[PDB]
Design a protein around this nucleic acid. Structure first.
Ligand SMILES: [Zn+2]
Ligand SMILES: [Zn+2]
Ligand SMILES: [Zn+2]
Ligand SMILES: [Zn+2]
Ligand SMILES: [Zn+2]
Lengths: 103, 28, 84, 816, 174
RNA sequence: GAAUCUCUUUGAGUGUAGUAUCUGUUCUUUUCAGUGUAACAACUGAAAUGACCUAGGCUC
């Protein structure tokens, strides 16, 4: 993602199916994390859909997704829209260190 | 006396120029 | 640390998708080849710049100029013209 | 010695600090390891580090800290000897089986990194003696480990290994686990099995025929995982294995017949319509014969085959209602089912998938008797089924009678509930939303129950009472009773002073749903009296109370600005500006969203002074959120009001006020998309001083302004200010730190579209090669980003002449 | 920590400072204009002044400064205080030094407006300087009055023609 | 709720990545070869002593 470096996106050929965001990540561009002015729907590759993993949010990939995810207008102007499948794979160091910090 | 100073700044390094009397210059 | 290590990875990916991307040290030949491919693709792609090249070279058919441009992207195409 | 024994001391002190140490201590020692990892011997790093992870005294907290160090070292050193490979697999391998998926993933990143580090040849040499092990646990582990390696390096490179283990006549356990590897490979790759499935199939088929049963079962599960993960495509391959499944089903019975019916059942939906009808009808007989099986496994498989076969077009819904359905509901809805969850999920989901073929009124018809049963946890499951079924099929099928009995049972089972669950709310709500106009004659008692439940002494029943109102308010409008809206709203506004926050938030949410729906003037309390009773609630702390209160106040800000006097609005602003210290996000986002509503309500200049007074605070959350607030105010009330005040505020000598000014300007630029053009011209002398200033934060943050400004101001025709801005930026290319450099690069990329590709390139081509290995390393990055944004857009702009490069292009010099 | 002293901003265009170096730039942070150092807190500043590099810069500034930078006559009778204020200062600090006179050209003045004549300036430590215009190119400029005795004091002018009645505090000059 | 009396006032959170900036301590001589650097630098291994003359040596 933008703010967290250890995350690794997918970047494959986007399929025909739209990604989904959890209520918590709702209304955010998967690239720059901008809450404002959405533009288009995201699209994810086959290997990012398949089973239950398709229902998860495409940013945090933990909670279940509900709303379709949108690219903000700027990321569509820059063209970072069409790079590929913008699905985060690994969970990152922050979330894990939170989980084990609490218990 | 400022030992490290000339090595930083590049001075006290022997150098030569052919066109003026093959003159020597101590810094770049 | 980890950020740069992502930079290398996205470098490897974009260099795969978009073909030529200079990294740090790229030979003049390696880069000039990319320039050649881009230029030829522009000449063939737009029907405008294809009309212009076709009429200027006076070839008998558009497709001859287009295939000439495609063939020109391979290095051995020069020598191939010389053996005719 | 004594010099290098000091190193032996440094690694011990570090590792100690990471495992047991202060936060700021371990945080720096991690950096020291990552930067110094190359100069310490990996023999010493792993030789010292690994013995810690073996003891039993380590907590999960202290274990993950060591794991992270292992990962950071492995990803760096890049080359490792085989003994340490085996050791790291001994430590990391057990993680894939751990109870929670977090440890699974972090133990998976290890093996997927080591697979690249240690290479293909070494790990396979490590696994070969391990698969033959007599132990069950080790084999279970390195099945999963082997699959992780398989996905990591690609499956084809590791495939003949699997073929060797599977087809090995030497050892039996080698065949067993060699087959399990196909399981977890099928799981990890997901749909991506596909093309590899043929090669994988070389293993399974013959490995299915072993005389030993526990291998015959494992192959049967592999066929199920491959069959489901594939989906319709994989049929053409499984035809070879399709025959022996039938000679296995008709005989072996016991626990094996369960596995083979799982396999064939998972093979059904990918079969052609011709065969599907046959194989289904063959399976249904065995299904009916096996209804009475006490084994959990066999019931689980039966629910799978019924689960899949409903999708088959061959069987008619009449065939299901006449025969299979009544035998289903009576057997699998026994109250003993409702006690164990994993089988509950399968029974409910099976009923839901049968609801498609079956009539909605028929499925719901059979589901009313479990609703009216006395058992509570059984009524809950009976609710789940109705919820999901109604969600799929809608209520259009229901006759008035079932429509009455359903809602009756939902009221009853609603009022005795114990555990906190939304399944009633959604479900009892999913009913309402669907049939809402048809709901009217039932609405009077329902509300009464709520009005009783609000007075109940238990906090949960009060939560659940208030929550169900918020769902009914839209359908209550559709049922047109406004007097009930007012009576509710009054009773809630009276109950609004409750002690328990968790209930109070829900109460305020119901208030919200009432206020948004109903006519503003007809509200009884009314709003003008409502809000001054809300302002003390914002200090209730907790969260949900704050969230719901803020969203409600914002609803008033949209709908009813003119009621509360502007001084009271200023009290609101002073409470929110204090309130956004909250740790939660949505609290802050909602607060910032409300400043637009208030600034629209009363005025910009009374809010702006209050906000700018808050940028002098040290904490970062406060400054950033006030920056976003200034951005939203500038959007809603217009930039020409906020811009001169902010530009005046930037004159203050304090650092944090200046950075806050630049950031608020970033937000107010990305919020107004097009406008942005009239306003530049003023702010370039403001960016003039920002891009010049010494510290690296101003140069960072100001470039972020240049991104949002240049992207959506491009093509407007200014372009003489963006050349200025660029001329100020270019020298910053050499700057280090991650944050400034990414913002600067984004800035140059935005300026590329304001200036154009060529006018932007004229700066870069110079040092694009260059002697210095650094200037080169810096410019090739900007040329990379420009090349990604523009390929055929830079073609006229290359610096190439016939004598500049060997070949050039002879056709660019032609003229007609 | 700051000892309550106001450290002015760099741009405020100069109340005497304690150390005439540490400022606050246009931004918030603290600066040492010699060493060109940015300090976050006043403690770090006190460590800079107590540091070795600042001393080196102070000395280098010291060297940098130390390398660059039968006729008619008139008689004046200047009177001084009557033990009114000189009762608080008696620490043999140049107290033995008598008033001094010098001839100054008006070519240099704080205002630099008009000029072209000389002044017979007379100075004493506490009291304020005094001047007397001398239009005549030369008056009483004698020729070897005494018999060439060499105690230059300050100059030929002072020894040649001045008297300091220190007991009564009366300075005569002619 | 109402009635009376006295006195007073007014008129220290938290975690994940990452920068920036000060202080303290060392500067081994000298040559050659390798690494490295845009050039330096830095890193790696080997060894200058005796004599003479008016800064220098076709010096031994
Ligand atoms: Zn993907
Ligand atoms: Zn999410
Ligand atoms: Zn975006
Ligand atoms: Zn010269
Ligand atoms: Zn200083």
């Amino acid at each position: 993602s933008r703010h967290q470096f250890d995350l690794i996106m997918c970047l494959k050929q986007p399929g025909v199916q739209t990604g989904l965001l959890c209520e918590k990540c709702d209304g955010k561009c998967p690239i720059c994390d901008s809450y404002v002015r959405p533009k288009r729907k995201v699209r994810v590759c086959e290997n990012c859909s398949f089973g239950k993993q398709a229902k998860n949010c495409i940013i945090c990939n933990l909670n279940v997704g509900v709303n379709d995810a949108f690219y903000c207008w700027e990321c569509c102007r820059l063209g970072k829209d069409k790079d590929g499948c913008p699905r985060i794979l690994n969970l990152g160091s922050n979330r894990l260190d939170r989980h084990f910090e609490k218990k | 006396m400022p030992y490290w100073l000339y090595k930083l700044h590049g001075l006290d390094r022997e150098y030569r120029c052919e066109i003026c009397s093959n003159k020597v210059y101590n810094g770049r | 640390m980890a950020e740069k290590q992502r930079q290398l990875k996205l470098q490897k990916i974009y260099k795969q998708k978009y073909i030529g991307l200079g990294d740090e040290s790229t030979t003049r030949e390696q880069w000039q080849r990319n320039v050649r491919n881009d230029t030829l693709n522009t000449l063939q792609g737009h029907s405008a710049s294809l009309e212009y090249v076709s009429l200027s070279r006076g070839d008998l058919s558009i497709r001859d100029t287009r295939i000439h441009l495609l063939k020109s992207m391979s290095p051995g195409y020069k020598a191939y013209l010389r053996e005719e | 010695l004594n010099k290098d024994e000091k190193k032996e001391r440094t690694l011990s002190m570090l590792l100690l600090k990471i495992k047991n140490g202060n936060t700021a201590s371990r945080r720096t020692s991690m950096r020291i390891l990552t930067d110094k990892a190359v100069t310490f011997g990996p023999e010493m790093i792993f030789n010292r580090l690994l013995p810690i992870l073996l003891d039993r005294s380590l907590e999960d907290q202290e274990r993950h800290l060591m794991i992270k160090t292992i990962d950071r070292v492995l990803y760096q050193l890049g080359d490792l000897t085989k003994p340490y490979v085996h050791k790291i697999l001994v430590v990391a391998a057990p993680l894939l089986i751990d109870e929670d998926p977090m440890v699974r993933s972090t133990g998976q990143e290890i093996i997927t990194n080591l697979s690249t580090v240690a290479g293909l040849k070494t790990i396979l040499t490590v696994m070969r003696p391990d698969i033959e092990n007599e132990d069950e646990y080790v084999r279970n582990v390195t099945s999963r480990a082997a699959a992780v390696v398989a996905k990591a390096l690609g499956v084809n490179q590791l495939l003949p290994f699997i073929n060797a283990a599977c087809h090995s006549r030497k050892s039996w356990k080698a065949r067993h686990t060699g087959i399990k590897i196909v399981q977890q490979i099928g799981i990890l790759l997901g749909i991506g099995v596909l093309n590899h499935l043929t090669g994988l199939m070389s293993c399974i088929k013959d490995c299915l025929m072993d005389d030993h049963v526990p291998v015959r079962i494992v192959t049967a599960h592999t066929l199920s995982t491959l069959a489901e993960n594939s989906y319709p495509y994989g049929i053409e391959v499984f035809n070879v294995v399709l025959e022996p499944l039938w000679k296995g089903i008709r005989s072996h019975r016991g626990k094996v017949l369960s596995s083979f019916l799982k396999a064939v059942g998972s093979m059904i939906p990918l079969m052609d319509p011709e065969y599907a009808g046959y194989y289904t009808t063959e399976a249904m007989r065995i299904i009916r014969r096996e209804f009475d099986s006490p084994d959990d496994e066999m019931k689980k498989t039966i629910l799978l085959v019924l689960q899949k076969c409903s999708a088959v077009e061959s069987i008619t819904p009449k065939f299901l209602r006449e025969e299979i359905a009544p035998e289903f509901f009576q057997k699998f809805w026994v109250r003993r089912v409702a006690l164990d969850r994993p089988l509950n999920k399968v029974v409910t989901y099976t009923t839901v998938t049968l609801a498609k073929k079956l009539g909605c009124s028929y499925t719901i018809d059979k589901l009313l008797t479990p609703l009216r049963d006395e058992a509570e946890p059984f009524r809950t499951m009976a609710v789940h089924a109705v919820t999901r079924t109604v969600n799929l099929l809608g209520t259009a099928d229901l006759d008035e009678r079932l429509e009455t009995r359903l809602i009756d049972a939902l009221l009853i089972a609603f009022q005795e509930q114990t555990n906190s669950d939304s399944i009633i709310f959604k479900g009892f709500g999913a009913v309402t939303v669907s049939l809402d106009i048809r709901m009217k004659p039932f609405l009077a008692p329902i509300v009464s129950t709520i009005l009783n439940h609000l007075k109940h002494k238990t906090p949960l029943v009060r939560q659940h009472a208030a929550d169900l109102c918020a769902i009914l308010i839209p359908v209550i409008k559709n049922c047109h009773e406004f007097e009930m809206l007012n009576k509710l709203n009054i009773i809630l506004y009276e109950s609004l002073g409750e002690v328990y926050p968790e209930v109070l938030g829900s109460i305020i949410n119901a208030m919200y749903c009432i206020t948004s729906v109903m006519d503003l003037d007809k509200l009884q309390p009314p709003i003008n009296q409502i809000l001054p009773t809300l302002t003390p609630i914002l200090r209730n702390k907790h969260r949900k109370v704050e969230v719901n209160t803020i969203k409600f106040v914002g609803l008033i800000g949209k709908l009813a600005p003119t009621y509360a006097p502007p001084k009271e609005w200023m009290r609101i602003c002073f409470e929110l500006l204090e309130l956004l210290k909250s740790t939660n996000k949505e609290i802050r986002r909602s607060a910032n969203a409300t400043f637009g509503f208030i600034a629209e309500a009363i005025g910009p200049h009374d809010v702006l002074v209050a906000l700018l007074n808050n940028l002098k605070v040290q904490e970062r959350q406060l400054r950033v959120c006030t920056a976003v607030a200034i951005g939203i105010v500038a959007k809603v009330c217009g930039p020409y009001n906020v811009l001169p005040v902010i530009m005046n505020e930037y004159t203050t000598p304090e650092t944090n006020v200046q950075n806050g000014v630049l950031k608020a300007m970033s937000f107010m630029f990305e919020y107004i998309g097009n406008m942005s053009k009239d306003y530049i011209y003023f702010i370039t002398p403001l960016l003039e001083d920002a891009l010049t200033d010494r510290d690296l934060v101003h140069r960072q943050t100001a470039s972020n302004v240049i991104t949002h400004l240049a992207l959506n101001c491009s093509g407007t025709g200014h372009e003489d200010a963006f050349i200025h801005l660029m001329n100020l930026l270019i020298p910053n290319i050499f700057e280090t730190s991650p944050h400034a450099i990414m913002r600067i690069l984004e800035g140059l990329e935005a300026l590329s579209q304001a200036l154009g590709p060529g006018l932007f390139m004229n700066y870069i081509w110079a040092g694009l090669f260059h002697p210095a290995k650094n200037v080169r390393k810096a410019f090739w990055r900007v040329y990379n980003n420009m090349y990604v944004m523009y390929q055929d857009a830079m073609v006229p702009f290359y610096p190439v002449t016939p004598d500049n490069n060997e070949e050039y292009i002879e056709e660019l010099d032609l003229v007609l | 920590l700051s000892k309550g002293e106001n450290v002015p901003y760099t741009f405020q265009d100069e109340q005497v400072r304690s150390n005439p170096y540490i400022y606050k730039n246009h931004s918030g942070k603290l600066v040492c204009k010699l060493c060109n150092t940015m300090h976050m807190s006043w403690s770090s500043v006190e460590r800079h002044l107590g540091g070795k590099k600042h001393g080196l810069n102070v000395l280098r500034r010291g060297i940098s400064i130390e390398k660059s930078s039968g006729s008619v006559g008139l008689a004046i009778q200047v009177n001084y205080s009557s033990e009114v204020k000189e009762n608080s200062v008696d620490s043999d600090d140049k107290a033995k030094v008598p008033p001094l006179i010098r001839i100054v050209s008006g070519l240099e003045l704080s205002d630099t407006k008009q000029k072209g004549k000389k002044f017979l300036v007379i100075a004493y430590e506490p009291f304020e300087n005094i001047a007397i215009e001398l239009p005549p190119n030369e008056i009483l400029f004698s020729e070897n009055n005494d018999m060439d005795n060499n105690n230059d004091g300050v100059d030929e002018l002072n020894k040649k023609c001045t008297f300091w009645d220190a007991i009564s505090k009366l300075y005569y000059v002619q």
